[PDB]
Amino acid sequence: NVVHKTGDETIAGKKTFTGNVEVNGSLTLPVQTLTVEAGNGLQLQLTKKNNDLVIVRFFGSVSNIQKGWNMSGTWVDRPFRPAAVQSLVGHFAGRDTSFHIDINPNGSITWWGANIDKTPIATRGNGSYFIK
Amino acid sequence: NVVHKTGDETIAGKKTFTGNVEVNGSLTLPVQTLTVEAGNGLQLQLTKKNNDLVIVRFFGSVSNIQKGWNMSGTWVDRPFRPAAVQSLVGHFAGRDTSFHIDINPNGSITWWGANIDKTPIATRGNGSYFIKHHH
Amino acid sequence: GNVVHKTGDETIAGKKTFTGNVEVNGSLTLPVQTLTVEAGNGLQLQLTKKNNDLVIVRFFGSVSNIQKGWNMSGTWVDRPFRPAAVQSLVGHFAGRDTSFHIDINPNGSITWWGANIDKTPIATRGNGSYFIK
């Protein structure tokens, strides 16, 4: 039940390192992913590592929404919801223009681009937030 | 004075794992937060993990600033300053338009949106940088 | 003695799988690599990759003579920095209200997804993050 300086080993218990720790190989942490059909044609692909850092990738295209409106689709599942509202910037493919969405702590998503009419505009980009 | 394969333990010393490490529970690293009234109505909420990765959340509303001007507010505290100038993109709420700011290693912030006249414009978004961006 | 101690600087081989919770009060240092890319059309990327997974890209340079959906006509991203899946990274034009994005593709090519840019260079800046895995 001792940890050695060689060999593959499994280690249980809470280990608190008070100093500097270096890893020269790979550090593997939990990863979870989620796809959200957020509404109005917007899709989010979320990847969460260490139950904290989330990178959101925008897909789809948005139409028929105004600033301040919540997207009319599926809310972000509980394990991806941030503790505070997170504003994620995205870009309209092939344009000079951008938008942001807010992912609210309840999982709802609020649109904060300009109003978009019936003509969809492709939405892309990566945004990052911390859950805690 | 020995680390075991069970139990809660505290481990002092620089420990270098030359191979692979996996953590199946939570990995807790240092976290520090700071709110900065940057100037010109712009507010930054910074969260720094592992004295390295920072996510900056923009709040407030900017007015009366020209491109390339330092913002006329509070400088970023030393622990949050990057080693190289970092450009963080933000978005004006309810608009098609965006800006960026440069967070300078000295703690200052430079505005790099368009010139903004006296009417404030709400500023939002998350941007991330490494303090230790270099190998 | 081949055991890890609760004191002292020590180097430790073997894959160590911590099935529980781990806390680091000092700094955790993971592998870091950097790359500068003249991506084409004046666009420059400075990339930092940590743990062979998280990448922050920093845009520099000034872009000209590029159309939407065209691949940029410069150096492709070196293999170690390529994402598994296409990653769209938003950038900002310095001193302007306008923005762009590029797609960093799995082969290291980069596709321009701003508006078309004619002969006059516009300065490009900003950070974007992605996971390789």
**CB contact (8 A) between residue B67 and residue C95:** yes
Report the structure determination method. X-ray
Q: State the Cα angle at B107 between B106 and B113, rounded to 5°.
A: 110
Homologous superfamily (CATH) for A29-132: Phage tail base-plate Siphoviridae RBP, head domain (2.60.40.1830)
Q: What is the DSSP string of C62-111?
A: EE-SB-TTPBPSSPPPPGGG--SS-EEEEEEETTSS-EEEEEE-TTS-EE
Resolution (A): 1.6
Tokens of B7: 């139990």
Separation between Cα atoms, residue A65 and residue A63, nearest integer Å: 6
Buried b (16+ CB within 10 A) or exposed e, A81-101: bbeebbbbbbbbbbbbbbbbb
Within 8 A of B58 by CB-CB distance, chain A residues are: 87
The CA distance from C18 to A10, in Å, is 6
3-class secondary-structure state, position B6: coil
Q: Say how many C-beta atoms besides its own lie within 10 A of residue C95's C-beta.
A: 19
Touching chains, A (3+ CB pairs < 8 A): B, C
Q: Does A6 touch chain B (CB under 8 A)?
A: no
Q: Is B78 on the interface with A (CB under 8 A)?
A: no
Would strands B98-103 and C16-18 be described as parallel, antiparallel, or unpaired? unpaired
| Residues C48/B133, Cβ–Cβ less than 8 Å | yes
Distances, alpha carbon C67 to alpha carbons C41, C43, C64, C72, C118, in Å:
10, 13, 9, 9, 8
Residues 6+ apart with CB under 8 A from B90: A89, B58, B98, B99, B100, B101, B123, B124, B125, B127
For chain B, the structural domain boundaries read 29-135
At C79, give phi and psi (nearest 5°): -55, -45
Residue position matching structure tokens 């081989």: C13
Long-range contacts of B42-48 (CB under 8 A, 24+ apart): B42/B71, B42/B73, B42/B101, B42/B109, B42/B123, B44/B76, B44/B109, B46/B76, B46/B80, B47/A130, B48/B79, B48/B80, B48/B131
Q: Tell me which residues of chain B, numbers 101 to 120, contact chain A at a CB-CB cutoff of 8 Å.
A: none
Tokens found for residue A78: 């509980």
Nearest 5°: the CA angle B7, B24, B17 is 80
Q: Is C1 on the interface with B (CB under 8 A)?
A: no
CATH code matching the domain that covers B29-135, chosen among 2.60.40.1830, 3.30.420.40, 3.40.50.1170, 3.40.50.300: 2.60.40.1830
B27 near B98, Cβ under 8 Å?
no
Instruction: Find the residue in C nearest to B49 (Cα).
Output: C27
The total number of residues written for chain B in this structure: 135
How many Cβ atoms from other residues are within 10 Å of residue B60's Cβ? 18
Q: Which CATH class is domain C30-133?
A: mainly beta
C-alpha to C-alpha distance for B32 and B29, rounded to whole angstroms = 10
Any CB–CB contact under 8 A between B6 and chain C? Answer: no
Rounded-to-integer distance, Cα B110 and Cα B103, Å: 7
Distance from C-alpha of B42 to C-alpha of C94, rounded to nearest angstrom: 18
C23's tokens: 């806390």
Which residues numbered 79-98 in A keep a CB inside 8 Å of some CB on B?
A: 86-89, 96-98
A37-63: b or e for each residue (b if 16 or more CB lie within 10 Å)?
Answer: ebbbbbbbebbbbbbbbbbbbbbbbbe
